[PDB]
Structure formats: structure tokens, C-alpha cells
Ligand binder design. Sequence first.
Ligand code: NAG
Lengths: 50, 34
Amino acid sequence: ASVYAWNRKRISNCVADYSVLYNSASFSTFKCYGVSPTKLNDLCFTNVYA
Amino acid sequence: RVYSSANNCTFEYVSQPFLNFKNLREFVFKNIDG
Ligand SMILES: *[C@@H]1O[C@H](CO)[C@@H](O)[C@H](O)[C@H]1NC(C)=O
């Protein structure tokens, strides 16, 4: 989507594997604010907004 | 014909079907801790 009309997808009722994203070399920026990437694969959240 | 609109969904779950009078179906529904 365009930045003015950015798409929001609500991710729920599944298991989120964050190590797949973190270990990819295809991303230039993977900056996490407020949480660390190492403990993302352990913690649990109500919903994920993409 | 049971509804006219569906705006904001938070949860969807599709499962296997649960189902003289021949059948007796007992159900208990509880709302505990969400
Ligand atoms: C719920 O739906 C209305 C319109 O259908 C929308 O304006 C509102 O932002 C929605 N709220 C949430 C939390 O999705």
C-alpha cells in the first residue's frame, strides 16, 4: 500500500515465530522499540498489528 | 437470514460439526476469565 493509505492487518489466533524474520538477511532495518528481538519468540501478546 | 452487517471482527474459529425425539443434546456455556 501507499504510505497515505497504509494497510493494517490484524494478526490473531495463531503462533508467531519471530526468529524467521530476525534471522533473515533480506532486511536492512529491523529496529525494535520497547522490546528486544531475542525475547519476542517467548512472549505472548493479545493481537499483532501489521 | 440472521444478520445484516459485520463490521469489526476479532476472532474466527471453524471446527468439526457438533451435531418421536431421537437425539438429546446437552450443552454448558460458561464465561470465566474471558
Ligand atoms: C469499528 O467499525 C467502525 C465502522 O464499522 C469503525 O469506524 C471503527 O473504527 C471500528 N473500530 C475498530 C476498533 O475496529
